[PDB]
Amino acid sequence: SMEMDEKDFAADSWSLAVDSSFLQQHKKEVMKQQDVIYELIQTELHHVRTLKIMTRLFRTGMLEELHLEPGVVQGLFPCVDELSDIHTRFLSQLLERRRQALCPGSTRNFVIHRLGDLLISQFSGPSAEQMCKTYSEFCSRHSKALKLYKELYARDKRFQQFIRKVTRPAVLKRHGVQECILLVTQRITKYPLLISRILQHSHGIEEERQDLTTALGLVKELLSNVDEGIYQLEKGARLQEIYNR
Amino acid sequence: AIRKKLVIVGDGACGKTCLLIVFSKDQFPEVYVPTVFENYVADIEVDGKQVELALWDTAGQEDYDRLRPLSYPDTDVILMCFSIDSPDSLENIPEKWTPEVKHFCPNVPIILVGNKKDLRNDEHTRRELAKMKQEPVKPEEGRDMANRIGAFGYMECSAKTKDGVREVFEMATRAALQ
Ligand SMILES: CNC(=O)c1cccc2cc[nH]c12
């Protein structure tokens, strides 16, 4: 992540991020709504960060330092460039909505009143089709990626030294290879939880309550489609084991 | 330190997310209680042994039968949760959550955890449950269910007051080391 965004999302909540004199000007319900919207953006910033560790620290580092057989790096990090493109674009939209809402003279005081439309756009049309296609591919290759990782770590000395080297810093404590893969797979099922809690505090404007209700429905339809499109790939699986599924 | 992996399973209202948050921060948040939990790696020393315990939640995966099992590979200990204010969450343990964990995590120790133990003597909870001919889960009902499902052990805690929380994760670490 970049320093500007890390500092904007350093506090544990929106109520601790804004100045206290600004917080005092809002009703309790607005503060509860903004605290959950802040959590959605903060966790999206961290999810994009997880994808950058995968593309830049691991994938590119293995290509530039190690002599792995062709197709091995793709097997460890399936669809990472596509996932990075989807979420970096979505994060850009969330951060621009926050930036436009800032008070003049402030880099931290804002209120986002219209999130629903942004979520409907993300979870409908071509962006939804791309999210569905990419997670159905990623989640079907999840078990294969973990097994390939374990095999390489156990048998390749240079691979083991590389992993131990780049995961040694304390800021990588939660982000080893297997941990990044599970963090990405789990991201999509966090959205309905976050959206339902934002909706709970967005009744003040009927158009916003309706938009968030529509967005929640679209995220659930995407999750159902992804879940129905998954079948774990396994290296060396025979056609007979596949058609006898 | 040796690395171990813990996954918590249970119904949507069982309190698993809150339990992970309170343990990972060593505090019930005073300003904002997060909606979700990403992951965490706890430094735990139990009975003289140092462990790095990776913590994972399954919240949000309850309705997705092909996504949810992706949380299980190489799990060392399972926390199987129910809420003491919800006898219905205890009922779903033996024939929904238990066969799933036994299939994807063979031979992995399961600790049955009764969450929200502070609601066992809460008048509002006792009144709401009496309308559906129910009462808070009794300690013997929790122990018998843990005995029935072949759990390594039975434990209770309250994320709200932190009582029992540290003991759950220290025992989970010991189970993961066996
Ligand atoms: C996920 N939908 C929710 O409504 C929700 C979630 C987590 C905490 C709270 C507190 C109030 N509502 C909550």
Ligand SMILES: CNC(=O)c1cccc2cc[nH]c12
């Ligand atoms: C035996 N194959 C299975 O896929 C299976 C078995 C038990 C529970 C679940 C939940 C999802 N899949 C399950």
Ligand SMILES: CNC(=O)c1cccc2cc[nH]c12
């Ligand atoms: C179907 N099995 C059981 O119901 C069972 C099994 C073991 C202990 C107890 C205590 C109560 N029920 C038990």
